[PDB]
PDB file of N, CA and C in Angstrom:
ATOM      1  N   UNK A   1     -54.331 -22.877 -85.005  1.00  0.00           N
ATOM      2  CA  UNK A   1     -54.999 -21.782 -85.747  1.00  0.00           C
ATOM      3  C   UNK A   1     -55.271 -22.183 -87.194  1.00  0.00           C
ATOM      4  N   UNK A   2     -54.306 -22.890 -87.957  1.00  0.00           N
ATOM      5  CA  UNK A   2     -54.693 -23.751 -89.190  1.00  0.00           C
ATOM      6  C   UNK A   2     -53.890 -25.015 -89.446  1.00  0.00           C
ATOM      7  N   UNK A   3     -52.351 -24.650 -89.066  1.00  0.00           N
ATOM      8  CA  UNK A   3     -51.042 -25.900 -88.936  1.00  0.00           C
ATOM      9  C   UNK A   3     -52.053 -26.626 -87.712  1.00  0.00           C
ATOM     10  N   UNK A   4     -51.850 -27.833 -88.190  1.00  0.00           N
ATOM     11  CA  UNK A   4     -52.305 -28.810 -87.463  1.00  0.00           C
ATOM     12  C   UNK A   4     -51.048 -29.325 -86.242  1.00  0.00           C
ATOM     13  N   UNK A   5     -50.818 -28.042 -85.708  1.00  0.00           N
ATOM     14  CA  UNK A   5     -49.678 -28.355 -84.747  1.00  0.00           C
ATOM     15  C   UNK A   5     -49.357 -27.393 -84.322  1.00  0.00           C
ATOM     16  N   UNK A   6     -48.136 -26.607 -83.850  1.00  0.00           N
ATOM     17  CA  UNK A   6     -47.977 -25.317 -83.395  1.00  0.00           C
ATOM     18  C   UNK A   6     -48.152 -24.999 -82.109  1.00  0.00           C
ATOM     19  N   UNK A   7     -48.457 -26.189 -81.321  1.00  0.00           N
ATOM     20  CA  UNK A   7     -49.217 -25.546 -79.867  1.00  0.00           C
ATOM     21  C   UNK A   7     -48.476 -25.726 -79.133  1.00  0.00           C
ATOM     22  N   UNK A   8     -47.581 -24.744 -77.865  1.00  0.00           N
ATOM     23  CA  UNK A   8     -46.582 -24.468 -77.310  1.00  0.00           C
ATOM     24  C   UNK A   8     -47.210 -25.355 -76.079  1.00  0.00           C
ATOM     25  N   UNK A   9     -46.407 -26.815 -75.810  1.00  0.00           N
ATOM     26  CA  UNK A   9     -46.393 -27.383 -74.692  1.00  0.00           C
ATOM     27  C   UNK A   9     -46.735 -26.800 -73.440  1.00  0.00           C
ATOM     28  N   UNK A  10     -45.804 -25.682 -73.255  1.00  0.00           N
ATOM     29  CA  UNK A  10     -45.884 -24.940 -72.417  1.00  0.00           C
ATOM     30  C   UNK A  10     -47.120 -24.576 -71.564  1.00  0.00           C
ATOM     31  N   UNK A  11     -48.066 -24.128 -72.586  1.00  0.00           N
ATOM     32  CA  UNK A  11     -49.439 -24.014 -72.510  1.00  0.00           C
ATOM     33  C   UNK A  11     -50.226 -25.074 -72.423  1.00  0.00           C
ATOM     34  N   UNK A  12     -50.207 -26.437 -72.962  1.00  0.00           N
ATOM     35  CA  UNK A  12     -50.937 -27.414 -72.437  1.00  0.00           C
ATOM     36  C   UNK A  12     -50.683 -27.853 -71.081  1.00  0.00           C
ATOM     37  N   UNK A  13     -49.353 -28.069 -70.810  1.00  0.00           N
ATOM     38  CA  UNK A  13     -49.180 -29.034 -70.012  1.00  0.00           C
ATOM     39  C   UNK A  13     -49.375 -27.965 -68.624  1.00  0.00           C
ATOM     40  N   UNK A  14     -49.468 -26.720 -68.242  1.00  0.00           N
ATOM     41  CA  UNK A  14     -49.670 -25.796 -67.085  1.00  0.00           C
ATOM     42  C   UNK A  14     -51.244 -25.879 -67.409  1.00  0.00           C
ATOM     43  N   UNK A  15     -52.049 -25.817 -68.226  1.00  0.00           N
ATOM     44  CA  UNK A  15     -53.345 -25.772 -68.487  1.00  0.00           C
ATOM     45  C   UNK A  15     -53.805 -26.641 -67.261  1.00  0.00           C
ATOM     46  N   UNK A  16     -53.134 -28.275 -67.488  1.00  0.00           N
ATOM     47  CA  UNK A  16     -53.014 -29.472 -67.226  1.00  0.00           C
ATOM     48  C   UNK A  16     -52.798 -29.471 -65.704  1.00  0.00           C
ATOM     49  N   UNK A  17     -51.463 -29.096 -65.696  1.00  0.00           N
ATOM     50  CA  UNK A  17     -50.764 -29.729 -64.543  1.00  0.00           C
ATOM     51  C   UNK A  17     -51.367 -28.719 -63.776  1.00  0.00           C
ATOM     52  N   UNK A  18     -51.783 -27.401 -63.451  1.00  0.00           N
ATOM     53  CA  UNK A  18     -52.463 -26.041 -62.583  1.00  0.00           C
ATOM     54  C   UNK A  18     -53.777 -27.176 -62.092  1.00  0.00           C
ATOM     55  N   UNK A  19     -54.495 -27.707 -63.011  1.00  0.00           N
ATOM     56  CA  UNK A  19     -55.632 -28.403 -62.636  1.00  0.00           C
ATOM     57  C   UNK A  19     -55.724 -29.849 -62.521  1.00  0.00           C
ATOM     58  N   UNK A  20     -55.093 -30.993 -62.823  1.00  0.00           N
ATOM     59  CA  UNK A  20     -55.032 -32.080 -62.369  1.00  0.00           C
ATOM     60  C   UNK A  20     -54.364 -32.536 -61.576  1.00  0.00           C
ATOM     61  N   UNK A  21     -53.054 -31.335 -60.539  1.00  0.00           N
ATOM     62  CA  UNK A  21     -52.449 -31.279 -59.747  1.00  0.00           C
ATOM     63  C   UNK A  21     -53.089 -32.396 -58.316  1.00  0.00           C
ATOM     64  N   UNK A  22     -53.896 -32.473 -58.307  1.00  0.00           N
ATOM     65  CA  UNK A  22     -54.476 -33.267 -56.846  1.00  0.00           C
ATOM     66  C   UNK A  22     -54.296 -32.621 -55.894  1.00  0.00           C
ATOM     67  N   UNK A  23     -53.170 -33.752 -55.542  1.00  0.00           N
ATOM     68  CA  UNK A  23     -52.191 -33.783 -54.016  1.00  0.00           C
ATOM     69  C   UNK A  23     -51.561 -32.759 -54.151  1.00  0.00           C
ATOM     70  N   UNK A  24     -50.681 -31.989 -55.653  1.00  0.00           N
ATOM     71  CA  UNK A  24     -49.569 -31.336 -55.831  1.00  0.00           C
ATOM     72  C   UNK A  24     -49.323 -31.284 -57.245  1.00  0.00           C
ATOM     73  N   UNK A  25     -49.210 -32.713 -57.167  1.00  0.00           N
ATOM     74  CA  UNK A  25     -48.683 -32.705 -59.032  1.00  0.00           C
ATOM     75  C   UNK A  25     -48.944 -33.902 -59.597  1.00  0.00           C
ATOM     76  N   UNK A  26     -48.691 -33.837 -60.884  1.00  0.00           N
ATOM     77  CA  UNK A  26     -49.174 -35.388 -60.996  1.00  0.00           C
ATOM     78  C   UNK A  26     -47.832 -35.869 -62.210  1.00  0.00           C
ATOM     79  N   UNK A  27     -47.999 -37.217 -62.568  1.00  0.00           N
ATOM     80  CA  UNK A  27     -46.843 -37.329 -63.735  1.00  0.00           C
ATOM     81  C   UNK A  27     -47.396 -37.449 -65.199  1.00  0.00           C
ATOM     82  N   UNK A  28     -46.316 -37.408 -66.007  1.00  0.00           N
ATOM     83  CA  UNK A  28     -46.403 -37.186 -67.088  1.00  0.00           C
ATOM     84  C   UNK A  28     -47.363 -37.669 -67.958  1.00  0.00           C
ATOM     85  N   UNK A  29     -47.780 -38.874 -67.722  1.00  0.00           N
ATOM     86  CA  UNK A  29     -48.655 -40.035 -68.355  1.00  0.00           C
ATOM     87  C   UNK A  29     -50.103 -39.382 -68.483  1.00  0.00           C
ATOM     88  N   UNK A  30     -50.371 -38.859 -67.076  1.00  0.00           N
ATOM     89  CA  UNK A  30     -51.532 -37.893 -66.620  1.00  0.00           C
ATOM     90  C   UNK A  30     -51.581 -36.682 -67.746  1.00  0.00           C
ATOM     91  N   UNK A  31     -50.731 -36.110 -67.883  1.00  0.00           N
ATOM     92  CA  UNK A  31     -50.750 -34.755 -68.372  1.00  0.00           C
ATOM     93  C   UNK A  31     -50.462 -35.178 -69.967  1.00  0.00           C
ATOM     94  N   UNK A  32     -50.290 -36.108 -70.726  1.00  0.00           N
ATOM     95  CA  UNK A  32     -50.249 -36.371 -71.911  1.00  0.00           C
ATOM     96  C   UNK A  32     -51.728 -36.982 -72.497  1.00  0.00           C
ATOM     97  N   UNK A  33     -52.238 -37.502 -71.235  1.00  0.00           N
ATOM     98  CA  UNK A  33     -53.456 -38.036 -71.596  1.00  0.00           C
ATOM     99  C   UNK A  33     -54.265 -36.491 -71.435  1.00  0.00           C
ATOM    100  N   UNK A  34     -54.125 -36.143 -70.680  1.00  0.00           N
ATOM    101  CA  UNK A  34     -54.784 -34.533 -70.065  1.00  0.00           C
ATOM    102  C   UNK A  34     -54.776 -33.845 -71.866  1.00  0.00           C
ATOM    103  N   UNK A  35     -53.303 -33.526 -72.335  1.00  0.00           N
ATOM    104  CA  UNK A  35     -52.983 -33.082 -73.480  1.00  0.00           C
ATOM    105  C   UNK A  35     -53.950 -33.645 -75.085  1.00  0.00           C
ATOM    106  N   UNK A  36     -53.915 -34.762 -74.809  1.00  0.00           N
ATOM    107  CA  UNK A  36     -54.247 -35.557 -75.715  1.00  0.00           C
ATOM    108  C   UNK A  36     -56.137 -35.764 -76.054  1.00  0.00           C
ATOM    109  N   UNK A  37     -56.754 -35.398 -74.583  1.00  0.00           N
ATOM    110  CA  UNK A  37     -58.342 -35.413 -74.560  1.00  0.00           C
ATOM    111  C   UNK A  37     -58.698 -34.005 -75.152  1.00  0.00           C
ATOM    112  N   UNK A  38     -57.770 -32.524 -74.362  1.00  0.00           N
ATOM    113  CA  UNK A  38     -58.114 -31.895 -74.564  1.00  0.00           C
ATOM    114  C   UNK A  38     -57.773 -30.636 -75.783  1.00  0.00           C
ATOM    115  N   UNK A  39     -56.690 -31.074 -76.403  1.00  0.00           N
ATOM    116  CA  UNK A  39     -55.633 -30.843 -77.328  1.00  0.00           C
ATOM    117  C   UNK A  39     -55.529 -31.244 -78.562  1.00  0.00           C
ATOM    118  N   UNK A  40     -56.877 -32.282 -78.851  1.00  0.00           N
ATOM    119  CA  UNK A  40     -56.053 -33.468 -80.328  1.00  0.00           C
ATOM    120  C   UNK A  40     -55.150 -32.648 -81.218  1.00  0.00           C
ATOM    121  N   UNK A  41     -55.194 -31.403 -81.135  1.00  0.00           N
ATOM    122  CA  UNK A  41     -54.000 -30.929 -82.219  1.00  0.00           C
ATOM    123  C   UNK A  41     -52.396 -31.011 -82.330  1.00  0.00           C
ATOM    124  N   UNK A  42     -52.148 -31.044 -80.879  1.00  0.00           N
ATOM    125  CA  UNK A  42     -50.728 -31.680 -80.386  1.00  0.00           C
ATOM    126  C   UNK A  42     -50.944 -33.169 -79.704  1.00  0.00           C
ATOM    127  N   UNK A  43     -52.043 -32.831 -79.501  1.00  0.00           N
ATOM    128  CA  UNK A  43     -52.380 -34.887 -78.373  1.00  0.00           C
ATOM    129  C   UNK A  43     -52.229 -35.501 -79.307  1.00  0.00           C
ATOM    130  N   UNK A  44     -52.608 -35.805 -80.812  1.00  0.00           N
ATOM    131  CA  UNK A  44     -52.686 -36.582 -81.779  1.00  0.00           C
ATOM    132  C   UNK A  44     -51.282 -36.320 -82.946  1.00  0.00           C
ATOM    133  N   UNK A  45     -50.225 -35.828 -82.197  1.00  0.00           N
ATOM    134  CA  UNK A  45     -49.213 -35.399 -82.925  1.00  0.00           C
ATOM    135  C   UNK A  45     -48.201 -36.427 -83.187  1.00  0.00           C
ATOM    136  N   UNK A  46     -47.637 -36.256 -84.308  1.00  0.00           N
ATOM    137  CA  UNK A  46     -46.700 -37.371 -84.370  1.00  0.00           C
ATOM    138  C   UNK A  46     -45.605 -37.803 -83.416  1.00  0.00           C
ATOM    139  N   UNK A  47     -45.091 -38.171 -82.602  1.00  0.00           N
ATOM    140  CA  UNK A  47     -44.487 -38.336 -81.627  1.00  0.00           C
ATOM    141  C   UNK A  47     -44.476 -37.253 -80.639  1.00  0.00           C
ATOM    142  N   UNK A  48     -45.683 -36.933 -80.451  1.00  0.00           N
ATOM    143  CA  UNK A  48     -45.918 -36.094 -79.269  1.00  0.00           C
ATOM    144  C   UNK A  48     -45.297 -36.603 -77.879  1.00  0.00           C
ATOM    145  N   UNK A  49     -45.661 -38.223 -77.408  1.00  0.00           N
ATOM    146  CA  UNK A  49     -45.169 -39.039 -76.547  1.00  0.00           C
ATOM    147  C   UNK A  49     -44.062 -38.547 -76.107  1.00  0.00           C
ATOM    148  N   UNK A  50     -43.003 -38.563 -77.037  1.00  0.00           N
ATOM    149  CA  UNK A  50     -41.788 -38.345 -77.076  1.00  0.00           C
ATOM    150  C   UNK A  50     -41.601 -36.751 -76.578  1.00  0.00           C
ATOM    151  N   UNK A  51     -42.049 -35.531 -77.907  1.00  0.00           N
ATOM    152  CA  UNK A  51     -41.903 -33.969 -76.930  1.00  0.00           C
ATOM    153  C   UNK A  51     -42.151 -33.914 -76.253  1.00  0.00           C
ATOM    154  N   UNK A  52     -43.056 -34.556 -75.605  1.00  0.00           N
ATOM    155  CA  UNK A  52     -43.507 -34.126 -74.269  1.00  0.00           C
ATOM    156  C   UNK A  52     -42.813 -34.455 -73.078  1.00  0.00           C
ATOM    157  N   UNK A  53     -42.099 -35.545 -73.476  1.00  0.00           N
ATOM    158  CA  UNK A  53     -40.683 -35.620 -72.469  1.00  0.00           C
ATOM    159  C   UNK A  53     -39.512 -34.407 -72.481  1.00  0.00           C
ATOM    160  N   UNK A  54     -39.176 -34.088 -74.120  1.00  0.00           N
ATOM    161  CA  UNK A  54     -38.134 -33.414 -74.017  1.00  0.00           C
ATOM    162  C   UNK A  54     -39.110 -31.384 -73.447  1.00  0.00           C
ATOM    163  N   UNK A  55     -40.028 -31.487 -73.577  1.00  0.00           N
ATOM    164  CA  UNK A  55     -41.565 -30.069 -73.241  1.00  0.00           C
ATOM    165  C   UNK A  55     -40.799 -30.308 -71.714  1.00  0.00           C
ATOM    166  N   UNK A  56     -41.126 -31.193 -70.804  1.00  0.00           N
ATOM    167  CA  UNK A  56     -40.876 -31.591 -69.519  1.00  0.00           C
ATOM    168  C   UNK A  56     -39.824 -31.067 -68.893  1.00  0.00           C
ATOM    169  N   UNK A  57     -38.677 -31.528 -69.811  1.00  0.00           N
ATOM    170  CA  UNK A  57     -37.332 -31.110 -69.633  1.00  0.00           C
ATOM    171  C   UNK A  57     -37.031 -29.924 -69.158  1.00  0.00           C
ATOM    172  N   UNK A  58     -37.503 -28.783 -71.059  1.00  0.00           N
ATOM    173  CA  UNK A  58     -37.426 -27.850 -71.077  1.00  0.00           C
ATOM    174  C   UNK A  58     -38.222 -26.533 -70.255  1.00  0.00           C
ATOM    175  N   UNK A  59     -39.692 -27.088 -69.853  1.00  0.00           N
ATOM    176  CA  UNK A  59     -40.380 -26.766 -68.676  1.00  0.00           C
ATOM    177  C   UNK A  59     -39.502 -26.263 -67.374  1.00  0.00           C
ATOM    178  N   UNK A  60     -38.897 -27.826 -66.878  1.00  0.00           N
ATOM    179  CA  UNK A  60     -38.420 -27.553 -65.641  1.00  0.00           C
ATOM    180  C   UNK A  60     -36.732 -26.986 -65.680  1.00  0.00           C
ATOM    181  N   UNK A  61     -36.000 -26.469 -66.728  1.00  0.00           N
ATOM    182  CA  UNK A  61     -34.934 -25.887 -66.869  1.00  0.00           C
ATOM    183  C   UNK A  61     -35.279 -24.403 -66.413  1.00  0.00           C
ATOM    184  N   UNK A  62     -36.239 -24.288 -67.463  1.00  0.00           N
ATOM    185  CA  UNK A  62     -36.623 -22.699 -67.789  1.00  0.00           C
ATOM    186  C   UNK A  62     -37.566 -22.265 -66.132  1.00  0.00           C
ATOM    187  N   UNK A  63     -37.728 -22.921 -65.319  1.00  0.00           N
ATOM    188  CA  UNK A  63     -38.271 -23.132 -63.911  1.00  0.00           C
ATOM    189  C   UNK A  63     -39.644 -22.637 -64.819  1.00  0.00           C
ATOM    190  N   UNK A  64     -40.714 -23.237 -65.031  1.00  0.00           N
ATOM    191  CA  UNK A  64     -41.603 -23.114 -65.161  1.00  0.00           C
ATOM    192  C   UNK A  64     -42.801 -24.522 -64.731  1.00  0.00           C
ATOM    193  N   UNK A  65     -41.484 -25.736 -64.851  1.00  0.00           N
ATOM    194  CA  UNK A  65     -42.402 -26.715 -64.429  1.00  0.00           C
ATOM    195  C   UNK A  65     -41.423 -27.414 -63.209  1.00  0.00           C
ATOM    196  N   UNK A  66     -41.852 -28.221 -62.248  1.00  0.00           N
ATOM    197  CA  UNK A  66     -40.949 -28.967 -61.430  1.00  0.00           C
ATOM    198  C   UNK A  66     -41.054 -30.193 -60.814  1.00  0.00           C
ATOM    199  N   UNK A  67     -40.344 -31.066 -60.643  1.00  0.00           N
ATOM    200  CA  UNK A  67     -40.453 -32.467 -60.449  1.00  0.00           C
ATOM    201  C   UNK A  67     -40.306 -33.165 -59.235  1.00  0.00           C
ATOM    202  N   UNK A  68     -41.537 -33.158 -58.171  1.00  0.00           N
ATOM    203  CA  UNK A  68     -40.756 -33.038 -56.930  1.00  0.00           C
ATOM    204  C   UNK A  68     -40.623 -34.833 -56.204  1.00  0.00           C
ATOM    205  N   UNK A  69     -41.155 -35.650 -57.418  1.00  0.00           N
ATOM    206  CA  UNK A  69     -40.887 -37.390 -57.347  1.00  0.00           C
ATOM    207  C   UNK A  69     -39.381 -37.003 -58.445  1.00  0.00           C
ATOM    208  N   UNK A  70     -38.776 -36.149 -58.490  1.00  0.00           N
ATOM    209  CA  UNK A  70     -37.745 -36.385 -59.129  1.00  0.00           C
ATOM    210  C   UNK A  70     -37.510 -36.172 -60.886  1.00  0.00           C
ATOM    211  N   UNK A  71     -36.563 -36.846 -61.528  1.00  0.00           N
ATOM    212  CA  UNK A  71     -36.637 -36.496 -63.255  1.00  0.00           C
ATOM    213  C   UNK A  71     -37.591 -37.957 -63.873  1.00  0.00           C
ATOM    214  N   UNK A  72     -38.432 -37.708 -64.593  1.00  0.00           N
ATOM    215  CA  UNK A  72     -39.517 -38.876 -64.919  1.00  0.00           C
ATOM    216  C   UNK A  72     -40.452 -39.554 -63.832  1.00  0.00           C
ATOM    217  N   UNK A  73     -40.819 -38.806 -63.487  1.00  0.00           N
ATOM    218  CA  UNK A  73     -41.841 -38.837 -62.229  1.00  0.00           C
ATOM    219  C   UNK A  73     -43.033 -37.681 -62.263  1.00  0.00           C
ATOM    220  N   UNK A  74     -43.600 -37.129 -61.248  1.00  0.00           N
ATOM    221  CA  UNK A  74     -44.685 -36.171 -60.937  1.00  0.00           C
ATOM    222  C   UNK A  74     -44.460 -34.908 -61.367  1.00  0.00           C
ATOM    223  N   UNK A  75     -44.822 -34.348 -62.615  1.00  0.00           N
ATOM    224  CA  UNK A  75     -44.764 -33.010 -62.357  1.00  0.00           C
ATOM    225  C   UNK A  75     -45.695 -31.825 -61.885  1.00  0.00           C
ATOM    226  N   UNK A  76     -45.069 -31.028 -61.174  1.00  0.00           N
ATOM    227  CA  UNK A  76     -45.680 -29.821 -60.114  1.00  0.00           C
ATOM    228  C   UNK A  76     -45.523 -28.353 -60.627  1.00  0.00           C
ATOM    229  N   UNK A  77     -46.520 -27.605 -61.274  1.00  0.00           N
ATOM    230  CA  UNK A  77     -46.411 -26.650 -61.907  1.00  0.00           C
ATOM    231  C   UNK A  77     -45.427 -25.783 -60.553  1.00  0.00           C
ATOM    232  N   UNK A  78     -44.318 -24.972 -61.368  1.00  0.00           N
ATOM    233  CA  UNK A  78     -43.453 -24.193 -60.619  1.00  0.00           C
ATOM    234  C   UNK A  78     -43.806 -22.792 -60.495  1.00  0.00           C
ATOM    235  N   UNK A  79     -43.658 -22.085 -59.071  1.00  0.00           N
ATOM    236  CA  UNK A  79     -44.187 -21.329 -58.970  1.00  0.00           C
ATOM    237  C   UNK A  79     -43.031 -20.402 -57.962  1.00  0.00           C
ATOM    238  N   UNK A  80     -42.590 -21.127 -57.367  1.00  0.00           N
ATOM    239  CA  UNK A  80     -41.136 -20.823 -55.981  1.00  0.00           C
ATOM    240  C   UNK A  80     -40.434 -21.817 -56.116  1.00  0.00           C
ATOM    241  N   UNK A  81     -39.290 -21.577 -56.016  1.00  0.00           N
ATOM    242  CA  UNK A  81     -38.552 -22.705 -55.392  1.00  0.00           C
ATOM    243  C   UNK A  81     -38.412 -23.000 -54.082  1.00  0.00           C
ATOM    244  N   UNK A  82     -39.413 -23.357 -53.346  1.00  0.00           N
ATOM    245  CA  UNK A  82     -39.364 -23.555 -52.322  1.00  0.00           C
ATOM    246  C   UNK A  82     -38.758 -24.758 -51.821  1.00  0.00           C
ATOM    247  N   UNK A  83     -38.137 -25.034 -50.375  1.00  0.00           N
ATOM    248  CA  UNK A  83     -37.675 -26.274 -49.856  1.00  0.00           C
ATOM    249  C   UNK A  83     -38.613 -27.456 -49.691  1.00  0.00           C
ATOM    250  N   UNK A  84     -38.065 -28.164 -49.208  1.00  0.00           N
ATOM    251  CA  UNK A  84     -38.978 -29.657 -49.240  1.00  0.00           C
ATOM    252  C   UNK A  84     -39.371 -29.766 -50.686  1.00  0.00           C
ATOM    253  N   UNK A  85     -38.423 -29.884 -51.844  1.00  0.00           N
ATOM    254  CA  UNK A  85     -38.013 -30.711 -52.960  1.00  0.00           C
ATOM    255  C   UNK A  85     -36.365 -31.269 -53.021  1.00  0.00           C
ATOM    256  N   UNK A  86     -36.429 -31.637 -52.169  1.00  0.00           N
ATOM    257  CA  UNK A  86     -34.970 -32.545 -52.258  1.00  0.00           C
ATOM    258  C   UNK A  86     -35.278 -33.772 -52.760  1.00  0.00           C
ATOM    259  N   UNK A  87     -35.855 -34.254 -53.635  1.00  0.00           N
ATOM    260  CA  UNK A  87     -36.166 -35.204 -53.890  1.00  0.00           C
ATOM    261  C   UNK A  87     -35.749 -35.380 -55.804  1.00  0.00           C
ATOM    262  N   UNK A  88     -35.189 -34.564 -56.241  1.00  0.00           N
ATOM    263  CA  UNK A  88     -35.134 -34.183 -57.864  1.00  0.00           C
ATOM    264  C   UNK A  88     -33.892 -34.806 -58.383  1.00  0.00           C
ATOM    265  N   UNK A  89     -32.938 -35.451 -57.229  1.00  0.00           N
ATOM    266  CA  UNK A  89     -31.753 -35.683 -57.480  1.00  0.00           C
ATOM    267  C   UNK A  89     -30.678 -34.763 -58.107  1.00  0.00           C
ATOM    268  N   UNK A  90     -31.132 -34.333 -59.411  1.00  0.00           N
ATOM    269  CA  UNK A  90     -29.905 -33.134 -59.988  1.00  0.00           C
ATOM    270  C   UNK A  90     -30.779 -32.534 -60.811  1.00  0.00           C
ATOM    271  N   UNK A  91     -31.658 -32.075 -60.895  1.00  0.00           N
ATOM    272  CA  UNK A  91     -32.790 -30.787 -61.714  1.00  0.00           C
ATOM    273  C   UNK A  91     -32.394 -29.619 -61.690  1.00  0.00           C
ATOM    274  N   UNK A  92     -30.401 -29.523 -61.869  1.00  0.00           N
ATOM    275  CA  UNK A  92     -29.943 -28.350 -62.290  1.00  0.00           C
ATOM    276  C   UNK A  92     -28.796 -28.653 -62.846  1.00  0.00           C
TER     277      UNK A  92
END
């Protein structure tokens, strides 16, 4: 809005991940570049690279985002917790 920053991950990366989903979901690399084309205000942020790991984190705690290649892998905007994600190892 004028801070050259301010923009709640949250909102990019579901922007993102709702639509570059494919198959399901896609990983992080995807959705930072996704962030970064369509975003320069957080895409071009100073260690954005980096929040957007700990955005990820906090995403899939708060069940809003989910990882179904696991932690640092594909993420799958969350919607249910549905079965057939045994694959997360410990994502609680």
């Amino acid at each position: 809005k004028e801070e050259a920053s301010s923009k709640s991950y949250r909102e990019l990366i579901i922007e993102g991940l709702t639509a570059l989903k494919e198959r399901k979901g896609s990983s992080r690399p995807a959705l930072k570049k996704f962030i970064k084309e369509n975003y320069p205000i957080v895409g071009s942020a100073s260690n954005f690279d980096l929040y957007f790991n700990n955005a990820i984190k906090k995403g899939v705690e708060a069940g809003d985002f989910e990882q179904p290649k696991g932690p640092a892998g594909a993420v799958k905007l969350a919607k249910k917790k549905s079965p057939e994600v045994k694959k997360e190892k410990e994502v609680s």
